Assembly symmetry: D2
Homo-oligomer: 155 residues x 4
């Protein structure tokens, strides 16, 4: 297991370290990939950004930081890596995250949540949306597994 | 490695199957946890929802579906599980997802991205935010790893 | 100007009052439309929810609360209303919101921001995405106004 | 009524024009404010960006484009403007947007939705969250209008 966490890291922040900390728990090796990002006109040089994130990550023993110019998917290929890591710039899922907090000190503890972004097709599918279609005797056949469609709709 | 994907699954949809497909690739065992959700007044009974998602997942050999009443964090404890799986109901990160698509058929291929939701503190931290503070000679000491602060700020 | 803020309001919360407060500043009349939502199996009756939100909004003189069964777009038609109001369940735009906060007590003050959700086509368009396409000598003709395309691309 | 839509517009895109089109319908005058954004190292000069967005907006008769260096809140003050316009870079609210689409050609038609970002406090408040607290005999007094608290909780 290799995971890759790519970014510009101009400079590395506590948010980045948090994601590195959390994701490095999941792979045998986490590669932190520092993109040149010449187009972004970064404040700090590629060498400085690499060295800084190296300095800030040396406590994570299974983390290796590497600089690259571009072609992230080919960098992934070189590492035999099929899994990338990204931080969200959106906060959502508030009720769930509230329940997780409570757990994370008095109940179970230290539970991580991994988020999966829906495919474009699937973003417009939810159980609620399907139930509404069912209620209005509409066609939900394109929205649910074929194994269950006969059990929830007819004629 | 055990991961848990909890939900009401009233009924299971193609979005759920996609998340089960993608997340089951990551754990030795994926537990799909079907919550009673009495409060939501579900359309289908707990037994029906469990049986339907079982029927729709029987092709994923490392997936086991289980019904539960509540106390998700304690269900996680029972499985020695420290990692939960969730689907986002937001689509974001469009430029990144556009680049991943291109890769995913002509470049590398089939790369997954795992998303990490920022802590409340960290949502208000970005490299751009830090650079702006630096430029206005402000205090960024609470926003970046202590290992790098002396390299990006002074006096 | 009539605006409509629809919801189930089961029960009305401080979040709802905040949105009513902010949006009522924008219309000659704000109609708060309380949906029956029989499908959601609400905790409080439609009558109770209407009366509660009425009680909680009576200080906003240009707000009128009305119960309805469904067909929101036709309710809008009845009011000659072409503008609906909704609260986001996502927090995003953190750098911008940080700058707005600072302003909102020491600079200008009390500035509201109205957010517009992009069309499905347009979510995958940004200036950054366009610049990247330009750089790789790609086709951006479908992404920018025709008035400017000749000024940013050729051959 | 003056509204301000600020941005870098490097270059103006169809997404920007859509937001200008939709928001200009709402104010007596919409000011499109083109920020220098020297820090972003823009591809096109400030003069070019202003002239391009002017060219692309000349059909919107109540739109005026103006260049500025910074201090957006003070630019708002100069215009007696208390309302800013922004496009979301997140797509959410899928069930609602699906219902709006259907309406927008066979039902009512051309209904706009204005989105309001919740305050930090209020993001963690929803009716569902309040109902859950009620059910567990918890304290919801900080989450709902004081006018209704006695009606939903006691002792």
């Amino acid at each position: 297991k290799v995971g890759i966490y790519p970014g510009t890291f101009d400079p590395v922040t506590n948010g980045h370290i948090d994601i590195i900390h959390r994701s490095s728990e999941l792979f045998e090796k986490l590669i932190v990939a520092v993109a040149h990002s010449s187009a972004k006109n970064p404040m700090f040089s590629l060498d400085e950004r690499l060295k800084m994130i190296q300095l800030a990550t040396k406590s994570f023993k299974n983390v290796e930081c590497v600089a690259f110019e571009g072609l992230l998917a080919y960098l992934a290929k070189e590492y035999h890596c099929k899994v990338l890591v990204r931080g969200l710039r959106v906060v959502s899922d508030f009720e769930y995250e509230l329940q997780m907090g409570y757990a994370n000190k008095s109940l179970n503890h230290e539970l991580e949540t991994l988020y999966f972004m829906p495919t474009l097709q699937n973003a417009f599918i939810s159980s609620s949306i399907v139930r509404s279609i069912i209620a209005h005797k509409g066609d939900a056949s394109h929205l649910v597994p074929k194994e269950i469609y006969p059990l929830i709709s007819k004629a």
